Design a protein around this ligand. Structure first.
Ligand SMILES: [Zn+2]
Length: 271
């Protein structure tokens, strides 16, 4: 009858977990494709959705500023933090300086740890299907491992001293570390915050000093600040990167694998 039901906070975790669950469990996201996830405002329908689950998965590293308060309304549903075991990169400036940068899934090596944590939770809370979760998790892990060679090759035309990744949210720190990019951003983490107009001027200074050719925005936030930086510098506006959300299932970024690939492909063509 009713399959084992997993509810995740946002769409990246939904897609990773659905690959591990296969056709044995149904995984749904609370947030919809395109919605801003850090300061999402949960609704009554979200409470009912989470309460209907057999297992709830969230990122932790205080990504979902809303989750802990929201979860107080949910009874008798186990939960698992899918970043357990990942070493955080700290936020480097701003009102959240020192807090973990939550965007750990942008490193495919970290995604292997996400996969293991989700496998572990599925096997613990749905032991009847442990054989399928284990098989699916190892197969999906191999798919993630296979991305490393083509991703590095795609970015190989960019010499080291020109590998500057200028985005809007500083959401790419884990990807930048993996592939040897220096990061510049218009704000360190999504939030209601001050200091964005001034940081735009500082980013402007860095674009000049380093001859950076391209700047980007992201799919759940406004492209206006990055477009302004591009007009106030030589740099081109390189388009929309994906980090905090997948697209719709018919969109360009329907899966976690497509998110990593499209983000790297878009950076590469921006150079
Ligand atoms: Zn973000």
């Amino acid at each position: 009858a009713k399959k084992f039901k997993v509810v995740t906070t946002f769409t990246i975790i939904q897609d990773i977990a659905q690959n591990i669950a296969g056709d044995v469990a149904v995984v749904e996201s609370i947030t919809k494709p395109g919605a801003e996830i850090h300061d999402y405002q949960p609704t009554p329908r979200d409470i009912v959705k989470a309460q209907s689950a057999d297992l709830i998965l969230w990122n932790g590293m205080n990504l979902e500023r809303w989750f802990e308060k929201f979860f107080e309304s949910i009874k008798d549903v186990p939960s698992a933090v899918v970043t357990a075991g990942i070493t955080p990169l700290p936020i480097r400036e701003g009102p959240y300086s020192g807090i973990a940068n939550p965007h750990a899934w942008m490193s495919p090596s970290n995604a292997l740890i996400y996969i293991e944590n989700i496998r572990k939770a599925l096997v613990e809370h749905d032991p009847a299907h442990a054989e399928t979760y284990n098989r699916n998790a190892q197969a999906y892990a191999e798919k993630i491992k296979a991305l490393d060679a083509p991703l590095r090759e795609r970015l190989s035309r960019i010499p080291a001293e020109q590998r500057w990744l200028v985005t809007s949210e500083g959401a790419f720190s884990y990807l930048a570390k993996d592939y040897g990019f220096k990061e510049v951003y218009l704000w360190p983490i999504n939030a209601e915050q001050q200091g964005i107009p001034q940081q735009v001027r500082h980013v402007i200074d860095i674009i000049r000093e380093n001859k950076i050719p391209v700047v980007f925005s992201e799919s759940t936030i406004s492209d206006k600040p990055a477009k302004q930086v591009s007009k106030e510098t030589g740099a081109q506006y390189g388009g929309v990167l994906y980090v905090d959300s997948l697209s719709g299932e018919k969109g360009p970024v329907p899966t976690y694998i497509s998110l990593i690939n499209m983000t790297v492909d878009t950076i590469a063509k921006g150079f």
